[PDB]
Amino acid sequence: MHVIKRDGRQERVMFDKITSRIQKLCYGLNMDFVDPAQITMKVIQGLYSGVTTVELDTLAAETAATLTTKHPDYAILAARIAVSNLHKETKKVFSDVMEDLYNYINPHNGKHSPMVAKSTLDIVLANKDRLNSAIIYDRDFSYNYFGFKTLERSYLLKINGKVAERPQHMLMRVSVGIHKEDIDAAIETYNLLSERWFTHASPTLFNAGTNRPQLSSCFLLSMKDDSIEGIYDTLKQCALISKSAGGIGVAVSCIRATGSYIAGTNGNSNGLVPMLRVYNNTARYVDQGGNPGAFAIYLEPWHLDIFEFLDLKKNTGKEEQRARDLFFALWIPDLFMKRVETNQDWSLMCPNECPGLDEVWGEEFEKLYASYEKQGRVRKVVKAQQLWYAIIESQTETGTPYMLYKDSCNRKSNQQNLGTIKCSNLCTEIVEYTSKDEVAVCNLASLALNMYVTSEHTYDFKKLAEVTKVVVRNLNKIIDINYYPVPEACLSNKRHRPIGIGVQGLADAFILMRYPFESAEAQLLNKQIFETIYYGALEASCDLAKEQGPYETYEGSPVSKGILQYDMWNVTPTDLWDWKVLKEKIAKYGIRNSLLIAPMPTASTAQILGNNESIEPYTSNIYTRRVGEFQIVNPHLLKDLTERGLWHEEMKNQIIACNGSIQSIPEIPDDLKQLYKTVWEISQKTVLKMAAERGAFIDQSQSLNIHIAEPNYGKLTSMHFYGWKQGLKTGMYYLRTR
Amino acid sequence: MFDKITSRIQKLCYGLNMDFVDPAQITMKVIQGLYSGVTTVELDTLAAETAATLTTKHPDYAILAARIAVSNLHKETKKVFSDVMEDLYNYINPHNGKHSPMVAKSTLDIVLANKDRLNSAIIYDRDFSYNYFGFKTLERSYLLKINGKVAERPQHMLMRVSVGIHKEDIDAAIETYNLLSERWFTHASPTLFNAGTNRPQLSSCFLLSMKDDSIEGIYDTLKQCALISKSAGGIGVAVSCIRATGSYIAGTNGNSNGLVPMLRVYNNTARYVDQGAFAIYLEPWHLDIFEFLDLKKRDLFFALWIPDLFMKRVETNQDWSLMCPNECPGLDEVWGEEFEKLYASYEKQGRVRKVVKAQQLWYAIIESQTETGTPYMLYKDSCNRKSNQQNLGTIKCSNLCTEIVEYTSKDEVAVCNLASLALNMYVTSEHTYDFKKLAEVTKVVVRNLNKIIDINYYPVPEACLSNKRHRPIGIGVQGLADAFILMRYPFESAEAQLLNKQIFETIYYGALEASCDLAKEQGPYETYEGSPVSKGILQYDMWNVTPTDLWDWKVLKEKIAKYGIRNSLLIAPMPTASTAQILGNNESIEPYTSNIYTRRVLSGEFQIVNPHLLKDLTERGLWHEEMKNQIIACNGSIQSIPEIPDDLKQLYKTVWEISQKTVLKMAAERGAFIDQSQSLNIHIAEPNYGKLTSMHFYGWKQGLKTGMYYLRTR
Ligand SMILES: CC(C)(NC(=O)CN1C(=O)c2ccccc2C1=O)C(=O)NCCCC[C@@H](N)C(=O)O
Ligand SMILES: Cc1cn([C@H]2C[C@H](O)[C@@H](COP(=O)(O)OP(=O)(O)OP(=O)(O)O)O2)c(=O)[nH]c1=O
Ligand SMILES: Cc1cn([C@H]2C[C@H](O)[C@@H](COP(=O)(O)OP(=O)(O)OP(=O)(O)O)O2)c(=O)[nH]c1=O
């Protein structure tokens, strides 16, 4: 028939032609129920006397995509269809893409617009010879579809509207954006970024090697002062960060509660309820412009406005008086948990009546708080369980507030010497020091935990621990060259140098190592997996101290005084790793990095390489993405449903009506039922259990979500108090129900 | 006892024309207190209260109601100024315990040395000069309050204001006091508030230009904004410089959300920081102009900064290009016959983001005004061509009240510290106007306001740099309505029109003669050289209005040509709401809005009628409880009731039936002797868009700076 080619000529569209043009790609697929026949069918069964070739692979790719439910290989295939009709549509070699990206011109103004950077490009052509050939473009056939169309949507820079990079072109520029002048490691960084041994978090990918590269995600802000001059110089600070697309965690603990005396202008303060709507509208003002930004507010429960802090995301409320786009978080000191569970009363205080109440934690905070109580100098006295179910009443309504434990989050941080951490980040994993002239930042890089497994289901620990070895130096260099939108951010992270190495797909990891997520083997691996990262991190940060000198303010720190993160948890480690010689190695030289581990949640940067989204296990065995609107079942799961033939259309529909609960239907081996157990089914005691076990080797904190489709009050009460009781820094990210 | 209170009562009824005043009916309504309880002051509490109720019978019951509250304010306040000042600095906040000096050591110290002459120069029978409703606006905020109890007397606060301004200058202090106390004028509200206090703010005015289009500049304007709302200041903001909705963002590759989500951050800011509200000045060429008049349809007041074109292409039924100040830069920053050439550029260059018929825009503004009242109308190309800061550059906005027109920049956020004139104190018991002292008093006020410039604690250093060079001062007025009424003029009359020419002339040449005097002493304001008046041509020349033979300006033109003036701008009629709800004079320059009005004192609601109306009504007997109701039924109008000699309903007519054609008339006739603008309110309660279209243009055809403040309906 009738398709106009890549030319401008015509070709007889034939089934024999297309089914073989797909057979060109199907390599690395068990091609036993993978079948290029029945792609071509629905395609040709709509092929009209028209329709070009690329605009036929629009059909061919998006059709093999929808038929991923037949096998998780079809997604990886539907990718190559779209990728190959991106390859023949994209410039073939790297230096030619880069040169073509800097000479970019904006057709609105005519203003010459450097997509990349002169700070980068000129080092790029400098090694054009080997760099260009050091790119295996056969590695963007290793991505799955639903990840690739997270890639091209916003990760692959386009020119005037259409794609300008290939995924490898994007990955190499990233590895060039990081090391710039360095090449022996730049291609090394690429050579792990490409075959997905890991990834840098979202912003490190976008504008690595653009002019003023902004390589940092979330940022942290303590309130400058208890002053409008300090407040709006804080408000400016964060508005600037959301300019440069930055997540933000703010300690607003420092602020005059509602009804607190103002000496300067003889009125009472308005509290945070009005002060925070200011941040609310700041958020959906400056997005970056084109989807919205949002900041995580960290108010400590001793603050008089804590109840009204909690009324703030009740679905639909009181209009002129309520905020939405802000995310809320609790920076909880041990004491509150204590006399909730002892059911003794609780004092609510103003940080001005009771000054310096946010800049103190733990045993030091036990008494300073009780000192005001004896003086009588508090505003509200309420039974501690009040504030407690009122929090749960807020969480059961929404999912917020977040739950961080200050006197667990400060007890076990390497930044203690700098003072009290008054807050965490947007997604509650980063626990760094913040102040008037300091706003520490997140240097983030996900780890694809599923990749370090043998085809014999044994773990490749000594490679995980040296990939991190590379991950740490990347994030170090990122600290220097990263554009800091605010001068304090620089002169913070330039000081402390905290980097946050996150992980993803430990959902997938447990599964592909053949472990049920709950098993006493997972458990048993969950240690060592995070022993591995931390070890490789400390080992890498140590080699860096002996080369560039320990960060500003290194000694004073827990490690400089000779006692490490797990030692703070009293959780003595496992003997993979000879920790004695690491401590000693850390001891002559030091470390370059204040904090290292931060299991940060990754969504887009997880969607991209098919791993399931942070540390959380699979939520629904069958789930969906939209870029049509495609059904996708768990890869792993269908991997085994087909190996032994228990997957039909009279099975797919059964699992959908289960929310992935493949536990009901008894034609599936209980070897798989245990293994692919949806997170809901998992009594979450064990998840936080696990978190605490792995948290011992986490410098900062870990963004943990909690899933119970049927959330009671005590069944939520006994949840937090498990996590807090057994040591966690971050108790809960979101609450998911239905 | 009944015969004990009535004695206690006209022991204060002196000066109150005792025919339609009667002391017994006061004692009668208070005996409902029934005694067997109530202190010695609770009596006098509701006794004043009772007298204030009866302003309905005579405006003298109000003045009496004052003294009652006042004579039992002096009872519960010690009687000497230096004492009051002493306890005001030796104040301790007992919620706390820390030392909190409510006045200033820097001023007390100044008080105690010149103590013996200051305390005696204070006349303490001038608190009796105020009337009740004025007195309890005073009670609330102006009189400093030691531990809840009023620590000051009106005198004690006013002498504090005098001493706060002159500081070491005592001879000029009793000066400013004796005409502050004899109500010959008054300073701005924040002045009377923190004059002589620790870290004093003496300004409200306050203007702001976006120091950029960038976030960095958006929030250092916002940082500045909250800082000023901290210091209890209302701001006019120039936001014309800001990216329209969707106008391509640079390195973030985003597109702008434009104005609306921005102003919402300012909205919320304006509500977060009280101890307030901001005005936002957006020129009609900005693209987001339609997303602009829907926000009004909130804590922000809105305003258009209109160039001559927009009107010229609204009459002529001609199109209109809405532009982005980024595609079409420097567009807000240019004015007049020149601006139209720059605007017509991007017209021909074609870079325009949305073009609509200009009259559609226009009625779209009338649609927002009829509902709300906003936006304020101020004519750009009509402000700068008649402004004395025309040399410093295009003035890009006005204040939150639209009387101030001052240059604003990267670090110059102009203030216009303020003081109003009691225009009704200048009359004879021979019904002729006293122009002599009006200059003389204005002579003083300029110098005080200029002392205020030097001592004022400025919230942002940018405001300091603006006031120290320009040294501008907004000298406003009040009781315009009462002046005509005491000169026995109708507001609309031609001898209202004579006099109003003259009235602002004497003020202008009173202020110019005053501003000329402290170029001698200190040296011309630094950016004098270049300004239109350093170029020997004044405000009334830019309107080309030949002044009255009243004064000899040829003399004044020629004083100024020598030494010069320490000030850039001089005249600027406020809307003196509280700042005038004290003396007994009608709010700014507008006529009597409604002959009978009511103010809410806490819980009570007292019927208060036009003090001159009733006092002329009663002179005839033709006033009563039926007359009374008939006037409230008209929401002000006394034209219905034919009993009234038709001479008096010319005199007291309300601004409703005062043909606005002719309000904007007199507004132009005085605007020539006004260095800045004028807060002009517009009043029609049944407003076809036709009326609004014709009243608006009458303004910019007549060359006004402010086309319109508020719209006012029902
Ligand atoms: C208030 C007044 C008329 N009467 C009182 O102090 C006490 N009293 C009575 O035994 C009595 C009986 C029946 C009706 C009303 C009253 C009443 O008021 C008074 O002047 N009583 C004289 C006693 C000194 C206190 C007093 N001057 C004050 O400051 O209120
Ligand atoms: C509404 C809105 C405006 N803006 C504005 C304010 C930012 O400073 C600007 C982008 O910053 P820049 O990229 O620095 O702006 P620019 O280089 O194009 O020139 P200018 O600063 O004068 O605009 O766009 C946003 O960035 N985000 C938004 O959501
Ligand atoms: C002016 C103002 C302050 N505040 C509160 C919140 C801020 O923490 C703080 C900043 O303003 P200030 O009260 O002026 O801060 P301050 O340290 O100078 O306190 P004081 O004047 O009593 O000596 O006041 C409001 O809540 N609303 C307001 O309008």
CATH of the domain at B150: 3.20.70.20
- C-beta atoms of A282 and B274 within 8 A: no
Dihedral sign, CA of B651, B585, B677, B366? negative
Six token digits for residue B383: 């402000």
Ligand 3 centre to CA of B141 (Å) is 19
Residue B179 to residue A613: CA distance in whole angstroms: 76
Residue A625 to residue B15: CA distance in whole angstroms: 86
Ligand 2 centre to CA of A238 (Å) is 15
- C-beta atoms of B268 and A289 within 8 A: no
Spatial CB neighbours of A309, under 8 Å, sequence gap ≥ 6: A272, A273, A297, A299, A303, A328, A401
Query: Alpha helices of A342-494 — where are they, by DSSP H?
Result: 362-375, 384-397, 406-409, 461-481, 487-493
Residue A141 to residue B47: CA distance in whole angstroms: 92
Mutate to test the interface with B, among A285, A295, A319, A483 (most CBs of B within 10 A): A285
Three-class DSSP category at B379: strand
Ligand 2 centre to CA of B291 (Å) is 19
* Residue A274 in contact with ligand 3 by CB distance below 6 A: no
Dihedral sign, CA of B426, B427, B428, B432? positive
Dihedral sign, CA of A168, A170, A171, A175? positive
Give the closest residue to B502 by CA, choosing from B487, B514, B516, B517. Answer: B487
Three-class DSSP category at A56: helix
Three-class DSSP category at A732: strand
Spatial CB neighbours of A331, under 8 Å, sequence gap ≥ 6: A251, A253, A298, A299, A300, A404, A406, A409, A422, A423, A424
Total Cβ atoms within 10 A of residue B455: 16
Spatial CB neighbours of A129, under 8 Å, sequence gap ≥ 6: none
Residue A368 to residue A365: CA distance in whole angstroms: 5
Residue A239: phi and psi, rounded to 5, are -65, -35
Asked if B528 and B459 count as a contact pair (C-beta separation under 8 A), the reply is: no
Give the closest residue to B394 by CA, choosing from B376, B404, B408. Answer: B408
Residue B203 to residue B418: CA distance in whole angstroms: 7
Atom of ligand 1 nearest to the CA of B1: 3
Give the closest residue to B417 by CA, choosing from B392, B451, B461. Answer: B451
Six token digits for residue B141: 């905020």
B576 is in an annotated binding site: yes
- C-beta atoms of B268 and A277 within 8 A: yes
Contacts B93 to A, Cβ<8 Å? 261, 263
Please tell me which of the candidates B248, B265, B275 has its beta carbon nearest to residue A267.
B275
Quick one: chain B helix, strand, coil %, rounded to 5? 45, 10, 45
Residue A732 to residue A400: CA distance in whole angstroms: 9
Give the closest residue to A223 by CA, choosing from A213, A214, A232. Answer: A232
Burial letters A611-648, b for 16+ CB under 10 A, else e = bbbbbbbbbbbbeeeeeeebbbbbbbbbebbbeeeebe
- C-beta atoms of A288 and B252 within 8 A: yes
- DSSP of B654-679: -TTTS-GGGHHHHHHHHHTT-SS---
Ligand 2 centre to CA of A286 (Å) is 9
Whole-Å CA distances, B661 to B38, B492, B538, B574, B701: 56, 10, 27, 21, 12
Asked if A697 and A565 count as a contact pair (C-beta separation under 8 A), the reply is: yes
What is the bridge-based pairing of β-strands A327-332 and A402-405?
parallel
Helix pair angle (B435-455, B494-515), 10° resolution? 40
Asked if B244 and B258 count as a contact pair (C-beta separation under 8 A), the reply is: yes
Six token digits for residue A282: 């700041």
C-alpha triplet B93, B96, B99: angle, nearest 5° = 50
Spatial CB neighbours of A560, under 8 Å, sequence gap ≥ 6: A550, A554, A590
Total Cβ atoms within 10 A of residue A294: 19
Asked if A247 and A427 count as a contact pair (C-beta separation under 8 A), the reply is: yes
Asked if B87 and B146 count as a contact pair (C-beta separation under 8 A), the reply is: yes
Asked if B586 and B559 count as a contact pair (C-beta separation under 8 A), the reply is: no
Asked if B675 and B475 count as a contact pair (C-beta separation under 8 A), the reply is: no
Residue A414 to residue A553: CA distance in whole angstroms: 11
Asked if A410 and A420 count as a contact pair (C-beta separation under 8 A), the reply is: yes
DSSP category for residue A4: B
Whole-Å CA distances, B318 to B82, B248, B355: 67, 29, 11
Spatial CB neighbours of A8, under 8 Å, sequence gap ≥ 6: none
Measure the CA dihedral B603/B609/B610/B616, to 10°: -150
**3-state SS, one letter per residue, for A240-304:** HHHHCCCEEEEECCCCCCCCCEECCCCEECCCCHHHHHHHHHHHCCCCCCCCCCCEEEEECCCEC
Amino acid letter, A714: G
Dihedral sign, CA of B231, B233, B239, B241? negative
Residue B145: phi and psi, rounded to 5, are -130, 110
Asked if B684 and B663 count as a contact pair (C-beta separation under 8 A), the reply is: no
A122 is in an annotated binding site: no
A→B contacts (Cβ < 8 Å), by residue, are: 106, 108-109, 210-212, 228-229, 231-233, 235-236, 239-240, 243-245, 261-267, 270, 274-275, 277-278, 280-282, 284-290
Query: Alpha helices of B456-587 — where are they, by DSSP H?
Result: 461-470, 480-486, 494-515, 517-521, 539-542, 553-560
DSSP category for residue A471: H
Nearest CA, atom 15, ligand 2 = B250
Give the closest residue to B537 by CA, choosing from B412, B387, B351, B668. Answer: B387
Element housing B444 (H / E): helix B435-455
DSSP category for residue A513: T
Nearest CA, atom 12, ligand 1 = B36
Atom of ligand 3 nearest to the CA of A226: 8
Please tell me which of the candidates A211, A244, A265 has its beta carbon nearest to residue B275.
A265
Ligand 1 centre to CA of B603 (Å) is 27
Residue B210 to residue B412: CA distance in whole angstroms: 11
Residue B533 to residue B540: CA distance in whole angstroms: 11
Residue B573 to residue B491: CA distance in whole angstroms: 17
Give the closest residue to A227 by CA, choosing from B100, B197, B459. Answer: B459
Spatial CB neighbours of A273, under 8 Å, sequence gap ≥ 6: A258, A305, A308, A309, A312, A321
- DSSP of B670-706: HHTT-SS-----EE-SS--HHHHHHHHHHHHHTT-SE
Rounded to the nearest angstrom, the minimum Cα separation between A655 and chain B is 41
Residue B260 to residue B675: CA distance in whole angstroms: 34
Ligand 1 centre to CA of B36 (Å) is 6
Total Cβ atoms within 10 A of residue B56: 17
Asked if B221 and B210 count as a contact pair (C-beta separation under 8 A), the reply is: yes
Rounded to the nearest angstrom, the minimum Cα separation between B437 and chain A is 36
Rounded to the nearest angstrom, the minimum Cα separation between A306 and chain B is 18
Ligand 3 centre to CA of A681 (Å) is 50
Q: Provide the terminal-to-terminal Cα distance of chain A, rounded to the nearest Å.
A: 50
Asked if B516 and B559 count as a contact pair (C-beta separation under 8 A), the reply is: yes
Structure-determination approach: X-ray
Please tell me which of the candidates B218, B255, B267 has its beta carbon nearest to residue A289.
B255
Residue A542 to residue A588: CA distance in whole angstroms: 9
Q: What is the largest CA-CA distance in chain B?
A: 88
B→A contacts (Cβ < 8 Å), by residue, are: 93, 95-96, 100, 199, 215-216, 218-220, 222-223, 226-227, 230-232, 248-249, 251-252, 254-257, 261-262, 264-265, 267-269, 271-275, 327
Q: Is the peptide bond before B490 cis (omega within 30 degrees of 0)?
A: no
Please tell me which of the candidates B100, B226, B275 has its beta carbon nearest to residue A232.
B226
Asked if A461 and A218 count as a contact pair (C-beta separation under 8 A), the reply is: no
B4 is in an annotated binding site: yes
Burial letters A354-384, b for 16+ CB under 10 A, else e = beebbbbbbeebbebbeebeeeeebbbeeeb
Spatial CB neighbours of B400, under 8 Å, sequence gap ≥ 6: B206, B234, B235, B236, B277, B278, B279, B301
**3-state SS, one letter per residue, for B5-56:** HHHHHCCCCCCCCCCCCCCHHHHHHHHHHCCCCCCHHHHHHHHHHHHHHCCC
Atom of ligand 2 nearest to the CA of B218: 6
- DSSP of A478-507: HHHHSPPSSHHHHHHHTTT---EE--B-HH
Which candidate in A254, A423, A427, A442 is catalytic?
A427
Six token digits for residue A125: 């052509």
Asked if B192 and B157 count as a contact pair (C-beta separation under 8 A), the reply is: yes
Is residue A427 among the annotated active site residues?
yes
B302 is in an annotated binding site: no
C-alpha triplet A674, A675, A680: angle, nearest 5° = 70
Domain region containing A338? 1-738
Rounded to the nearest angstrom, the minimum Cα separation between B457 and chain A is 13
Residue A182 to residue A131: CA distance in whole angstroms: 12
Is residue A466 among the annotated active site residues?
no
Total Cβ atoms within 10 A of residue A172: 29
Residue A513 to residue B147: CA distance in whole angstroms: 74
* Residue B35 in contact with ligand 1 by CB distance below 6 A: yes
Residue A736: phi and psi, rounded to 5, are -115, 135
Asked if B230 and B457 count as a contact pair (C-beta separation under 8 A), the reply is: no
Looking at the structure of chain B, the number of domains it has is 1
Nearest CA, atom 9, ligand 2 = B214
Element housing B304 (H / E): strand B301-306
Residue A538 to residue A592: CA distance in whole angstroms: 9
Contacts A286 to B, Cβ<8 Å? 215, 257
Residue A593 to residue A479: CA distance in whole angstroms: 10
Query: Alpha helices of B195-258 — where are they, by DSSP H?
Result: 215-230
HSE, CB side, 13 Å, CA atoms: give it for residue B632: 12
Nearest CA, atom 26, ligand 3 = A269
B198 is in an annotated binding site: no
Q: Distance from CA of residue B662 to its chain's centroid?
A: 22
Asked if A346 and A358 count as a contact pair (C-beta separation under 8 A), the reply is: no
Residue A693 to residue A524: CA distance in whole angstroms: 9
Ligand 3 centre to CA of B92 (Å) is 19
Which candidate in B49, B403, B590, B669 is catalytic?
B403
Asked if A81 and A22 count as a contact pair (C-beta separation under 8 A), the reply is: yes
* Residue B40 in contact with ligand 1 by CB distance below 6 A: yes
Give CB contacts under 8 A, 24+ apart, made by A182-188.
A183/A127, A183/A130, A183/A131, A185/A470, A185/A473, A186/A131, A187/A130, A187/A131, A187/A134, A188/A470
B96 is in an annotated binding site: no
Six token digits for residue B229: 């709302």
Residue A581: phi and psi, rounded to 5, are -80, -15
Six token digits for residue B269: 């800011």
A134 is in an annotated binding site: no
Total Cβ atoms within 10 A of residue A212: 13
Burial class (CB in 10 A: 0-12, 13-18, 19+), B1: exposed
Rg (CA), chain A: 27
Mutate to test the interface with B, among A109, A112, A233, A243 (most CBs of B within 10 A): A243
Rounded to the nearest angstrom, the minimum Cα separation between A315 and chain B is 21
Query: Alpha helices of B207-317 — where are they, by DSSP H?
Result: 215-230, 260-272, 308-315
Three-class DSSP category at A439: strand
Whole-Å CA distances, A645 to A26, A32, A648, A678, B708: 21, 11, 8, 22, 81
Contacts B262 to A, Cβ<8 Å? 285
* Residue B4 in contact with ligand 1 by CB distance below 6 A: no
Which residue out of B210, B212, B214 has the highest number of ligand 2 atoms within 8 Å of its CB and is therefore the one to mutate?
B214
Q: Distance from CA of residue B562 to its chain's centroid?
A: 33
Rounded to the nearest angstrom, the minimum Cα separation between B356 and chain A is 21
Is residue B401 among the annotated active site residues?
yes
